Amino acid sequence: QDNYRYIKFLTQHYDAKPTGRDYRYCESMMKKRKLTSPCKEVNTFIHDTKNNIKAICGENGNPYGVNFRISNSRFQVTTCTHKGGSPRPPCQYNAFKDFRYIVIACEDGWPVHFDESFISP
Amino acid sequence: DNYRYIKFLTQHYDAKPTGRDYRYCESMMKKRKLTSPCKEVNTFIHDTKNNIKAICGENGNPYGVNFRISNSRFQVTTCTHKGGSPRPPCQYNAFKDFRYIVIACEDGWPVHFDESFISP
Ligand SMILES: [Zn+2]
Ligand SMILES: [Zn+2]
């Protein structure tokens, strides 16, 4: 019921209204979501409703690994990957658009972590 | 101007459904004022405005002469009127589905939902 980790998940991993989904999108979003001090190396935005993402914690997800959940359907996502090595802003990013399953961690029915290491079929 | 697009959302967009049963349809139809007279068939899409609009763009394909089919499945709830009276209160059966949807777009914006479309 403390919303802190859930809102943190949203800040870092949720954008219902993307524009472009190219490197410029990634570079502006990583800045707007304050993920640039230091440059976050890999960060994926999910483009769907809070309700549908939350449903991965319940009806619309399967157990994955010890504690994660995998979605039962694909989600629109944009993965921003840091380029150029240096961890100090300004931060340059490559942007990878995808429609794929996502793996998250849930706590008390809410998304609290995004598994950036998951490789979807 | 936004009129037909907003009208499309009023009748067919709900990012935050609960229940998705007869009660959901009966409250939503009333809330969206689709009850004077009772609308016979009406589908609510449970996804973002952006993703639905994308059916008019990259996440859709041409369908028929004037329509668009989504390239992926959407969570939907179809409300089908029952009881036989066009007057409030309007009663509904709910059908939850995860399916392709067909819409009409105008200039990149969704303006109608094809209730007659039968998805694989
Ligand atoms: Zn939305
Ligand atoms: Zn009827």
Residue numbers in the entry:
A (entry chain B): 1 to 121
B (entry chain A): 2 to 121
Q: What did the study's authors say about this model?
A:
Angiogenin (Ang, a 14-kDa protein), an unusual member of the superfamily, is a potent inducer of blood vessel formation that was first isolated from the conditioned medium of cultured HT-29 human colon adenocarcinoma cells based solely on its angiogenic activity. The murine Ang family, over the course of evolution, has expanded to accommodate six members: mAng (the murine orthologue of hAng), mAng-2 (also known as mAngRP or mAng-related protein), mAng-3, mAng-4, mAng-5 and mAng-6 27–31. Experiments have shown that mAng, mAng-3 and mAng-4 have angiogenic activities comparable to that of hAng, whereas mAng-2 is not angiogenic 33–35. The main-chain of both mAng-2 and mAng-3 adopts the familiar α/β fold that is characteristic of other Angs and members of the RNase A family.
The crystal structure of mAng-3 contains a dimer in the asymmetric unit. The CSS for the dimer interface of mAng-3 is 0, suggesting that dimerization is merely a result of crystal packing. The two Zn2+ binding sites in the mAng-3 structure are completely different from each other. One of the zinc ions has only two interactions: one with the hydroxyl group of Tyr14 and the other with a water molecule. The second zinc site has five interactions: one with each of His82 and Glu41, two with water molecules and one with an acetate ion. In the mAng-3 structure, the binding site architecture is very similar to that observed for phosphate and sulfate ions in other Ang structures and both anions ligate the same five P1 subsite residues: Gln12, His13, Lys40, His113 and Phe114. In mAng-3, His113 from chain A is observed in conformation B, whereas the same residue takes on both productive and nonproductive conformations in the other chain. The nonproductive conformation of His113 in chain A of mAng-3 forms a hydrogen bond with an oxygen atom of the nearby sulfate ion via its ND1 atom. In mAng-3, the side-chain of Lys40 points towards the active site of its own protomer. Arg31→Lys31 substitution in mAng-3 is subtle and preserves a surface charge distribution similar to that of hAng.
